[PDB]
Amino acid sequence: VGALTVLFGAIAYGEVTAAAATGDAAAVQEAAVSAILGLIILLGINLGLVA
Amino acid sequence: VGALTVLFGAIAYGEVTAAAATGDAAAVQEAAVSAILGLIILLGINLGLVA
Amino acid sequence: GLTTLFWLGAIGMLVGTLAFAWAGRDAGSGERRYYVTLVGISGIAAVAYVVMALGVGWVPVAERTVFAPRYIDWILTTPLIVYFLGLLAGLDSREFGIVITLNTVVMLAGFAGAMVPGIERYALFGMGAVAFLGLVYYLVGPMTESASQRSSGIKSLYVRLRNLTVILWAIYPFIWLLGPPGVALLTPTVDVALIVYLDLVTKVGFGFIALDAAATLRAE
Amino acid sequence: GLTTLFWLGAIGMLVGTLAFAWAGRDAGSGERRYYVTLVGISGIAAVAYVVMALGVGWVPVAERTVFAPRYIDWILTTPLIVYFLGLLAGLDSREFGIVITLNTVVMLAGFAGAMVPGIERYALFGMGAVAFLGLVYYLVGPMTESASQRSSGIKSLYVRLRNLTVILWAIYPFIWLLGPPGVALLTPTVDVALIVYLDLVTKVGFGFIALDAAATLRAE
Numbered sequence: 001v002g003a004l005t006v007l008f009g010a011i012a013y014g015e016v017t018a019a020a021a022t023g024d025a026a027a028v029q030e031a032a033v034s035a036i037l038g039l040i041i042l043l044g045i046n047l048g049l050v051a
Numbered sequence: 052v053g054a055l056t057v058l059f060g061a062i063a064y065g066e067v068t069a070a071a072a073t074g075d076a077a078a079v080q081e082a083a084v085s086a087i088l089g090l091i092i093l094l095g096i097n098l099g100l101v102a
Numbered sequence: 103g104l105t106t107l108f109w110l111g112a113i114g115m116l117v118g119t120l121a122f123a124w125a126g127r128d129a130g131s132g133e134r135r136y137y138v139t140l141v142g143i144s145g146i147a148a149v150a151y152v153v154m155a156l157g158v159g160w161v162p163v164a165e166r167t168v169f170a171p172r173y174i175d176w177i178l179t180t181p182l183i184v185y186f187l188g189l190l191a192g193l194d195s196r197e198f199g200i201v202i203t204l205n206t207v208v209m210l211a212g213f214a215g216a217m218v219p220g221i222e223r224y225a226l227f228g229m230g231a232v233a234f235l236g237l238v239y240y241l242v243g244p245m246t247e248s249a250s251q252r253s254s255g256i257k258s259l260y261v262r263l264r265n266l267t268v269i270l271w272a273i274y275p276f277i278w279l280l281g282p283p284g285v286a287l288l289t290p291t292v293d294v295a296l297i298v299y300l301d302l303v304t305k306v307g308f309g310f311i312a313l314d315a316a317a318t319l320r321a322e
Numbered sequence: 323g324l325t326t327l328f329w330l331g332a333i334g335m336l337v338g339t340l341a342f343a344w345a346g347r348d349a350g351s352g353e354r355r356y357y358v359t360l361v362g363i364s365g366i367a368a369v370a371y372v373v374m375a376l377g378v379g380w381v382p383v384a385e386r387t388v389f390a391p392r393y394i395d396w397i398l399t400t401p402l403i404v405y406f407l408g409l410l411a412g413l414d415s416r417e418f419g420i421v422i423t424l425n426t427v428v429m430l431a432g433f434a435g436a437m438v439p440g441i442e443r444y445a446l447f448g449m450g451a452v453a454f455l456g457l458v459y460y461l462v463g464p465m466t467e468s469a470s471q472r473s474s475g476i477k478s479l480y481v482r483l484r485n486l487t488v489i490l491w492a493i494y495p496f497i498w499l500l501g502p503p504g505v506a507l508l509t510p511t512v513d514v515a516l517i518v519y520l521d522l523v524t525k526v527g528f529g530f531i532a533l534d535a536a537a538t539l540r541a542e
């Protein structure tokens with residue numbers, strides 16, 4: 001679960017950075033909310049698997 | 052751990068949204084990377100507590 | 103990229119398919135169906151992922167991107183997962199028909215809803231959501247009761263696979279709602295990444311858990 | 323806001339302080355010191371958080387924001403946590419002196435480094451990091467050996483508190499490095515939020531775990 005979370009984080013970071021390269025604050029915000037919700041969901045998945 | 056993660060997420064989202072309100076892509080990126088790393092660290096904390 | 107994630111999903115499913123096929127090479131007449139079913143579950147998923155990895159079935163519509171192969175995969179593989187669970191529980195034809203029917207409504211609903219622009223897609227989601235609760239009821243109730251009539255090992259395996267299934271399947275509708283099919287808060291990349299993870303666990307993870315119990319079941 | 327988080331930290335510490343104080347109202351002559359120590363740990367932290375909540379001690383320098391009360395708190399409370407662990411382990415003066423010395427270097431290093439602009443702050447971090455490894459060695463080695471000479475209940479409580487401490491304390495240096503004191507990838511808000519959580523667990527959580535074992539220790 002630990003390694004995967006970092007992997008997911010890297011992927012999410014990749015999107016945020018790509019969005020930033022455009023200079024559009026809105027695009028970065030979209031990628032960031034997606035990353036945040038995704039990480040939260042990832043916790044739900046990890047927790048369910050363990051249980 | 053579940054409720055806290057959502058609480059942390061809301062706080063992180065709050066920063067991303069505030070940053071977006073400025074229109075500066077760089078500011079949003081800063082808030083997003085912070086949110087991502089923070090959530091990853093939050094997992095580390097939660098996991099350590101459980102163990 | 104999306105293609106890289108799809109390839110990873112395909113590789114994961116292929117590894118699982120090969121493992122299950124090999125593991126069942128010398129399976130007895132009573133275990134046979136279980137191994138074959140597992141091969142079909144991950145095998146079909148492997149095809150779906152390869153198709154998507156090749157950039158086929160991508161439906162960028164209504165300002166969102168959904169993947170037809172994902173839903174077609176689900177429509178065909180989830181009923182096989184339910185069939186596997188049903189075999190362990192010892193269901194008869196009637197009971198199988200009930201859970202397969204419920205399962206099918208869930209999957210068809212998600213497929214149709216994902217392809218429908220506008221608020222009507224939430225009605226389709228609702229139909230699937232209700233059918234899903236009915237399916238969970240059967241898995242935790244009637245089917246668990248039925249499984250309790252079999253060996254301790256079978257009951258244990260059923261319960262283990264049942265829990266993994268109910269808990270993780272329950273997550274898919276939230277990803278559907280928050281992802282491209284719904285409000286689109288999750289980007290296609292994040293959406294696909296979460297589904298690749300869930301799919302591998304619900305199919306390959308599911309399979310290895312069964313493989314890991316095989317020896318114990320034979321011994322009892 | 324930062325002030326809201328600081329107030330939450332203050333409230334959490336106050337609740338803990340009051341709980342420990344009350345829980346120790348009728349403590350015996352041999353348990354007394356433990357309750358009093360816990361009160362001091364969360365009590366001092368409560369003051370630090372209130373001070374920061376009032377906007378005092380904020381050090382926005384070198385384009386980053388660090389909080390002096392945070393480090394002053396640590397310098398004064400972590401040695402009390404080590405003292406509590408040392409009491410359970412049954413250390414003598416010499417042994418106490420060793421771990422308190424190591425602990426102090428760690429905290430002074432983090433404080434000095436947080437207040438130093440430029441790469442030199444990483445040398446200070448290094449000094450603290452090395453001292454920390456020495457401290458962990460003592461907690462898991464010599465001190466665990468010493469604790470093993472006491473009752474089963476004390477050994478168990480020591481181990482439980484030791485594990486919580488080693489595992490969670492190990493996280494602080496990463497937050498220091500990734501946060502404002504270091505590369506500043508974490509914003510002040512996220513930095514403070516994580517520390518409030520860690521502080522409450524390492525002090526109040528730590529305390530409730532001890533309180534929860536008190537009755538068992540008396541009974542044995």
Ligand SMILES: *C/C=C(C)/C=C/C=C(C)/C=C/C1=C(C)CCCC1(C)C
Pocket residue numbers: 176179180183208209211212213226227230231234271272274275278301304305
């Ligand atoms: C092999 C992949 C698996 C196990 C897929 C499972 C998918 C589900 C349990 C999907 C459920 C849905 C609902 C309950 C509501 C409507 C939308 C769906 C299809 C996402």
Ligand SMILES: *C/C=C(C)/C=C/C=C(C)/C=C/C1=C(C)CCCC1(C)C
Pocket residue numbers: 396399400403428429431432433446447450451454491492494495498521524525
């Ligand atoms: C009550 C608060 C607690 C338990 C604080 C614990 C803080 C630490 C274990 C800090 C450790 C650090 C290092 C090991 C390296 C240098 C920087 C520090 C001070 C962040």
Ligand SMILES: CCCCCCCCO[C@@H]1O[C@H](CO)[C@@H](O)[C@H](O)[C@H]1O
Pocket residue numbers: 132133136137140189190256312313315316319
């Ligand atoms: C790959 C995982 C295989 C798990 C094997 C489960 C075997 C369940 O058990 C089998 O169920 C059959 C009914 O379908 C019976 O006819 C068999 O006698 C019985 O052993």
Ligand SMILES: CCCCCCCCO[C@@H]1O[C@H](CO)[C@@H](O)[C@H](O)[C@H]1O
Pocket residue numbers: 352353356357360409410476532533535536539
């Ligand atoms: C708030 C949590 C309190 C936990 C009580 C731990 C008590 C440890 O045990 C006590 O250690 C003393 C030495 O310091 C001895 O003198 C006492 O006889 C002994 O009971």
